[PDB]
Amino acid sequence: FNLDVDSPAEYSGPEGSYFGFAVDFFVPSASSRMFLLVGAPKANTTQPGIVEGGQVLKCDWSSTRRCQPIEFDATGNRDYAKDDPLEFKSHQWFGASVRSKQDKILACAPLYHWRTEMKQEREPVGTCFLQDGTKTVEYAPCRSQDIDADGQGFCQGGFSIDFTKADRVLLGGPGSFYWQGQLISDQVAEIVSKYDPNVYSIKYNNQLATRTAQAIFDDSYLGYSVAVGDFNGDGIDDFVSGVPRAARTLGMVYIYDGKNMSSLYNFTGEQMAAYFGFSVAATDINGDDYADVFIGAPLFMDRGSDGKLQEVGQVSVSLQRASGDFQTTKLNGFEVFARFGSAIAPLGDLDQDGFNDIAIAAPYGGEDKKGIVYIFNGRSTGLNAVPSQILEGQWAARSGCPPSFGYSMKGATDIDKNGYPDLIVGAFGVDRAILYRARPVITV
Amino acid sequence: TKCVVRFNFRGDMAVYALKAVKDHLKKEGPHWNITTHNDDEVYLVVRGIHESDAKRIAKWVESTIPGISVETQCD
Ligand SMILES: *[C@@H]1O[C@H](CO)[C@@H](O[C@@H]2O[C@H](CO)[C@@H](O[C@@H]3O[C@H](CO[C@H]4O[C@H](CO)[C@@H](O)[C@H](O)[C@@H]4O)[C@@H](O)[C@H](O[C@H]4O[C@H](CO)[C@@H](O)[C@H](O)[C@@H]4O[C@H]4O[C@H](CO)[C@@H](O)[C@H](O)[C@@H]4O)[C@@H]3O)[C@H](O)[C@H]2NC(C)=O)[C@H](O)[C@H]1NC(C)=O
Ligand SMILES: *[C@@H]1O[C@H](CO)[C@@H](O[C@@H]2O[C@H](CO)[C@@H](O)[C@H](O)[C@H]2NC(C)=O)[C@H](O)[C@H]1NC(C)=O
Ligand SMILES: *[C@@H]1O[C@H](CO)[C@@H](O)[C@H](O)[C@H]1NC(C)=O
Ligand SMILES: *[C@@H]1O[C@H](CO)[C@@H](O)[C@H](O)[C@H]1NC(C)=O
Ligand SMILES: [Ca+2]
Ligand SMILES: [Ca+2]
Ligand SMILES: [Ca+2]
Ligand SMILES: [Ca+2]
Ligand SMILES: [Ca+2]
Ligand SMILES: [Mg+2]
């Protein structure tokens, strides 16, 4: 209810670049100033022969509003042999997935392809660039000797990423092992230290990962979307992973132990093709010190009293109890074909009432399918099913694709330094990104 | 001596890959115990492969048919 939607900070990129596809905040531990990170996966770079390589832009905030590219990669395609390219950066979608912790920026390119040494091919392995301090290294955990569809060749590593409070990188690669999906977790120190630009396949010592399973798990896309939080009381963030096409396309969410990857919990959807697990989030929504799990299901159809089914979207909210048990309730969308629940973004305690709040988007709702973001407040009994605030998209589609306001969101970072965390919302269909700041809340 | 090698075929081309591998194995080992299954999960198993032959066929597959998961178990 306290977001300022009257005077928001609006940023834009080159037309056709999908600027605003993915957003995050950049907050160095002691720079005094903060930047917004806005991806533009189809942007035209200055690289020697790269078309629509994609880029990540570091957007300022105080004073004026300008965006500039980060030179994570200032070169083109390296050769393997004379007239035989090693890698293909054109149309790699760099900036499609971006996350940052302190001065560490992890920017990924899920459609990056390369040949491997064993044979000449073009496999969508996916790579990430990790920048910290004054050094940049390439992180590519799916770029290895285990190649092609049965291996990590089609991993698309970096599709979904996050950070663990233990200074570990959590990376989801939904295409591994014929799309069973894989989670990979490693240490920042290992990633930065064990770096050699002449080595394409790098092994790390403290890496954890999931493994290939039976064909009955094929095309499940595990690691489609990831999140972290403590689900066993060991003080170590565990791993939450959406698996949207699992269990006869009911969709599932898996929780793995953050120290040794042993499986801890399993959530299963109710309706086929609701695509349950599209997006997940882990946060304490009721003040119990136990992380709770939020699972989106954007294609869910809500059957009415006459038997008619309306596609509205659904979000499942489960509270963690000390026993390890979960208490689950359901929240349905409000508009037909708006796809409510496609994007879930914890805001932290948006209104400073002691309970965390969460934003849930419905990117194709509202007038002319501009897109709507719903703000839901928390409480001691779990999430309040009635939204407190409605954020509407402000732009018309220019070339078929809806602005898709609310497609990608990030909160829980306070940029204007007032104690109330702000929210950045992408609208890539019109190459825009908009920052909504949270107002102080006065109780009388 | 003797080992067991299993090939797991997945994807839209699983049956084409199965045929390509099966035909290769039949030519390399006309009298190998080659068993195939096309029920739900598609796979090929060769039993009694003469140990070194397990690596010889795995290498051929890796360099030819794109992505077949091969498991070798030797005593
Ligand atoms: C949340 O939900 C997930 C699934 O959605 C669940 O994970 C799955 O757990 C099962 C185990 O319950 C995994 O299935 C197998 O587990 C065995 C471990 O041993 C148990 O099962 C055997 C069965 O005979 C018992 O004898 C034994 O006592 C135990 O009970 C593994 O050994 C299996 O490994 C296979 O792959 C290996 C790869 O190297 C092979 O070497 C091995 O031989 C197995 O191959 C199988 O398939 C082959 C196909 O050709 C076949 O030829 C072989 O003969 C054999 O049948 C295997 O892992 C299952 O994989 C897990 N799936 C996923 C996605 O993780 C979580 O546990 C659950 N979590 C919670 C909290 O509920
Ligand atoms: C990036 O540059 C490419 C090449 O200049 C642009 O692609 C061209 O777009 C025009 C639009 O009228 C087409 O007629 C050409 O045929 C396209 N060429 C190729 C090779 O695709 C692309 O649109 C630019 N993208 C961005 C975001 O600026
Ligand atoms: C992971 O660590 C926990 C610690 O309590 C232990 O109980 C569990 O058995 C371990 N699992 C594996 C696979 O090592
Ligand atoms: C509609 O008709 C059914 C009987 O088929 C009845 O039980 C129901 O109460 C009616 N609903 C309304 C709103 O009249
Ligand atoms: Ca833990
Ligand atoms: Ca809780
Ligand atoms: Ca609150
Ligand atoms: Ca603020
Ligand atoms: Ca297909
Ligand atoms: Mg087919």
Residue numbers in the entry:
A (entry chain A): 1 to 444
B (entry chain C): 1 to 75
Quote what the paper states about this structure.
The RGD (Arg-Gly-Asp)-binding integrins αvβ6 and αvβ8 are clinically validated cancer and fibrosis targets of considerable therapeutic importance. The highly homologous integrins αvβ6 and αvβ8 bind to latent transforming growth factor-β1 and β3 (L-TGF-β1 and L-TGF-β3) leading to release of active TGF-β1 and -β31–3. Here, we describe a method for computationally designing hyperstable RGD-containing miniproteins that are highly selective for a single RGD integrin heterodimer and conformational state, and use this strategy to design inhibitors of αvβ6 and αvβ8 with high selectivity. We found small α/β ferredoxin folds were able to scaffold the RGDLXX(L/I) binding loop without clashing with the integrin while making additional contacts with both α and β subunit (α- and β-loop respectively).
To investigate the accuracy of our designed structures, we used single-particle cryoelectron microscopy (cryoEM) to determine structures of human αvβ6 ectodomain bound to B6_BP_dslf and human αvβ8 ectodomain bound to B8_BP_dslf. Using focused refinement, the nominal overall resolution is 3.4 Å for the αvβ6 - B6_BP_dslf complex and 2.9 Å for the αvβ8 - B8_BP_dslf complex, although the resolution varies considerably due to the intrinsic flexibility of both integrins. As expected based on the negative stain class averages, the αvβ8 - B8_BP_dslf was found to be exclusively in the extended-closed conformation. Y172 of the β8-SDL2 loops bends inward to form a hydrophobic patch similar to the conformation in L-TGF-β-bound structures. The cryoEM structure reveals the molecular basis for Y in the fourth position of the LXX(L/I) motif: we find that Y16 forms stabilizing interactions with A115 of the β8 subunit and interacts with the less bulky L174 in the β8-SDL2 loop. The equivalent position in the β6-SDL2 loop, Y185, is more bulky and we hypothesize that the steric clash would interfere with binding.
